[PDB]
Amino acid sequence: SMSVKKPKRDDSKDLALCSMILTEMETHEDAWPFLLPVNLKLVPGYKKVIKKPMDFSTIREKLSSGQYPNLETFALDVRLVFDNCETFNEDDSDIGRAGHNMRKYFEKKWTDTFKV
Ligand SMILES: CNC(=O)C(C)(C)C
16 A cells, blocks of 8 residues: 555566567467458458457567556457457367467466566
């Protein structure tokens, strides 16, 4: 509360570390469905169903332009990518499988990087 500060983690390297994690995501062989925004003019249903589209290139742009206030808002957008993917794709499809794989990949790197 007022004048009662918790000791808080050193967040000075967060931007660099999130960029490193995003780079590993971008270079994963299963990243291809997520590299660019879904084309809302070519994919029936997507605009109406997926209320907040997100993709790696959009995350990279927001990261590079100071649009994430903190590391949690970055993680929310990454997770949004895979939550959208689950909403629109069957688990037993290539993109569906890609999404689950990429989510798993992200969450381990997230834990390994920031959860001490
Ligand atoms: C991530 N891509 C998708 O979810 C499709 C709309 C199926 C192309």
